[PDB]
């Protein structure tokens, strides 16, 4: 089969090819009218470019404050990535971490932190050992840690990561944060996604489930740098939003007979809600406990 480096090059080309195709469908520069329905700056209309202009571009028309504080967009009542192109005339609201009900923003930040963990885990092990990405379980924020289910090589069936190893994963995550990479999104049909993730069995099964849920069988793809994954919902704009990030624990899920799925866990806080050293330590301890998604 393909080498690990070649596999990324194949997937990125397919991802880029599909991105270029959707851009061509756009006829010249058609204009959509996006009305602002937020509490502040009421009545502002944005005459934007269909399939090119994103919610971030609307924030840029207002002020830098919107761009810095806006983590997610609410497009016609639906959560919308800041960098996802707007496709129709619609109403738009901007969501922050400090809203009275930031539930959707929390989920978006919560899902993104798991996707950043998947990226480091896939690229951490030696080429000898095989890392198979399974899924990012949807666990409530109150659970205290985000988790990502991975399947490791048979050779590493008695290996449990050491504290220095857990710290090594954390240093890789912080390097991803330092790179300040945008979360690129692509809504593609199941067929396109199935081709990208053909080599991975878990993704194919996961991709099939998501397509079945939606009548039009379009699956949401996200990419950070050279890592592509399938997501449950809208993500945050960039990885630089994360400030405190640590991979806390790796648990072995039961039953172990069919396959040994290892639940990697972490906890993180954004720049906007950074915690004091003392409080952060208490969160790290609870994050190290196993979470059982309900």
Partner 1 sequence: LVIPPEKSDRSIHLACTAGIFDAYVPPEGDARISTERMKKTMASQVSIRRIKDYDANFKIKDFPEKAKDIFIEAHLCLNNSDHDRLHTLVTEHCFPDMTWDIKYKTVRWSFVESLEPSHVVQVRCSSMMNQGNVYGQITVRMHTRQTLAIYDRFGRLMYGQEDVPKDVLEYVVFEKQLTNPYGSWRMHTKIVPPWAPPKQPILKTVMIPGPQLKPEEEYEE
Partner 2 sequence: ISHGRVFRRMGLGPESRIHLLRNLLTGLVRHERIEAPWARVDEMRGYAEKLIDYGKLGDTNERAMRMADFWLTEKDLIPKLFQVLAPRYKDQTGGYTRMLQIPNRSLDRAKMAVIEYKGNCLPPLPLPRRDSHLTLLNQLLQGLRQDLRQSQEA
Partner 3 sequence: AAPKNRRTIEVNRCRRRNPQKLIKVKNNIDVCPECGHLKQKHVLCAYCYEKVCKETAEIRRQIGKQEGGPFKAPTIETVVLYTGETPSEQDQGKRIIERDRKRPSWFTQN
Positions that interact with partner 1 (CB under 8 A): 28-31, 36, 41-49, 53, 57-58, 61-62
By CB under 8 A, is residue 17 in contact with partner 2? Answer: no
Contact partner at residue 44 from partner 1, partner 2, partner 3, none, CB < 5 to 8 Å by partner kind: partner 1
Residue 251 forms beta bridges with which residues?
Answer: 263
Q: Positive or negative, the Cα torsion across 135, 101, 82, 124?
A: negative
Of positions 55, 234, 266, 270, contacts partner 2 by CB under 8 A? 270
Instruction: Give me the least distance between CB of 65 and partner 3, in Å please.
Output: 5
Binding track over 79-118 against partner 3, x by CB under 8 A? -------------------x--------------------
Of positions 28, 39, 126, 276, contacts partner 3 by CB under 8 A? 39
* Distance of alpha carbon 116 from alpha carbon 227, whole angstroms: 9
Instruction: Give me the least distance between CB of 235 and partner 3, in Å please.
Output: 24
By CB under 8 A, is residue 276 in contact with partner 3? Answer: no
By CB under 8 A, is residue 101 in contact with partner 2? Answer: yes
Residues that bind partner 3 in the complex, under the rule CB under 8 A: 39-41, 65, 69, 98
Residues that bind partner 2 in the complex, under the rule CB under 8 A: 97-103, 105-106, 109-110, 141-144, 267, 269-270, 273, 275, 279, 282-283, 286, 289
């Amino acid at each position: 089969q393909l080498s690990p480096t070649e596999l990324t090059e194949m997937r990125n080309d397919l991802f880029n090819k599909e991105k270029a195709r959707q851009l061509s469908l756009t006829p010249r520069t058609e204009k959509i009218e996006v009305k602002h329905v937020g509490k502040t700056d009421p009545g502002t209309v944005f005459v934007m470019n269909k399939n090119i202009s994103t919610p971030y571009s609307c924030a840029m028309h207002l002020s830098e404050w919107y761009c810095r504080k806006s983590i997610l967009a609410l497009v016609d009542g639906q959560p919308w990535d800041m960098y996802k192109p707007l496709t129709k005339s619609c109403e738009i609201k901007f969501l922050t971490f400090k809203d009275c009900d930031p539930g959707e923003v929390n989920k978006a930040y919560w899902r993104s932190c798991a996707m950043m963990m998947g990226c480091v885990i896939e690229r951490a092990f030696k080429d000898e050992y095989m890392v198979n990405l399974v899924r990012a379980p949807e666990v409530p924020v109150i659970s205290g840690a985000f988790c990502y289910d991975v399947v490791l090589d048979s050779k590493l069936d008695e290996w449990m990561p050491t504290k220095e190893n857990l710290r090594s994963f954390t240093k890789d995550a912080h390097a991803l944060i330092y790179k300040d990479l945008p979360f690129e999104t692509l809504e593609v049909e199941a067929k396109v996604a199935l081709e990208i993730f053909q080599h991975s069995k878990y993704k194919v099964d996961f991709i099939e489930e998501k397509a079945s849920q939606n009548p039009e069988r379009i699956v949401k793809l996200h990419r950070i740098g050279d890592f592509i994954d399938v997501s449950e919902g809208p993500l945050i704009p960039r990885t630089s939003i994360c400030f405190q990030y640590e991979v806390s624990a790796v648990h072995n899920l039961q039953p172990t007979q069919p396959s040994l799925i290892r639940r990697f866990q972490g906890v993180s806080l954004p720049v906007h809600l950074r915690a004091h050293f003392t409080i952060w330590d208490k969160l790290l301890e609870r994050s190290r406990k196993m979470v059982t998604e309900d």
